[PDB]
Amino acid sequence: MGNWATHVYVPYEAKEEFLDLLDVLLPHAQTYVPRLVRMKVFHLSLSQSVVLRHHWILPFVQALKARMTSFHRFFFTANQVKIYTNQEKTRTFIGLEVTSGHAQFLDLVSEVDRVMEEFNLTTFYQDPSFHLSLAWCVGDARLQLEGQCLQELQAIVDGFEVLLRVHTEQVRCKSGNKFFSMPLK
Numbered sequence: 001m002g003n004w005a006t007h008v009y010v011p012y013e014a015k016e017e018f019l020d021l022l023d024v025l026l027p028h029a030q031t032y033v034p035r036l037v038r039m040k041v042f043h044l045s046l047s048q049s050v051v052l053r054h055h056w057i058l059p060f061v062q063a064l065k066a067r068m069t070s071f072h073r074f075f076f077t078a079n080q081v082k083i084y085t086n087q088e089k090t091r092t093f094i095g096l097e098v099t100s101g102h103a104q105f106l107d108l109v110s111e112v113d114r115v116m117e118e119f120n121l122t123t124f125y126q127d128p129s130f131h132l133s134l135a136w137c138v139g140d141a142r143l144q145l146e147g148q149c150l151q152e153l154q155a156i157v158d159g160f161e162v163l164l165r166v167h168t169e170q171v172r173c174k175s176g177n178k179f180f181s182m183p184l185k
Ligand SMILES: O=c1ccn([C@@H]2O[C@H](COP(=O)(O)O)[C@@H](O)[C@H]2O)c(=O)[nH]1
Pocket: 043, 044, 045, 084, 085, 086, 087, 093, 095, 125, 127, 128, 129, 130, 131, 132, 133
């Protein structure tokens, strides 16, 4: 039956224009940290990765659908490069932090958090920072990526919509190997 890894997020469309930007940005970051790996799919988290008993997957998804489908779509900006780690500092990420639209993400998280509480699951991180992860590596590479590298990554981005005005259209829940989609209003 089992308990399934469950995660709620906004998917981010990997358009050619965005992937072409990564074609310039990520090799530059790899001159500092070659073992960075490009993300294959792109998302902005709305929940922690939690564990949910199997028989509650479908009811959890339906609860999310009910809430999300009355939530209005919005625009956001994600053009600020940031280095961050996972909680245990065994992985490092290069991401794009949301500026404009952060408050609307907080409102989405409020709704997701209520579903988490309904199913006795962990609510979102205190002091959250919404971001689109672009690449990751094992270990804590903050010392190598922050400073000169980060300034040059920011310069590449500043030199490039795609990032300025992204429209949220859907919310998705991954549970184990299952992916459940829903439209915003
Ligand atoms: O507000 C946040 C957002 C993300 N993370 C960390 O950043 C990792 C990568 O985030 P994501 O881009 O997968 O959401 C997460 O798994 C989590 O460890 C936080 O600590 N706080």
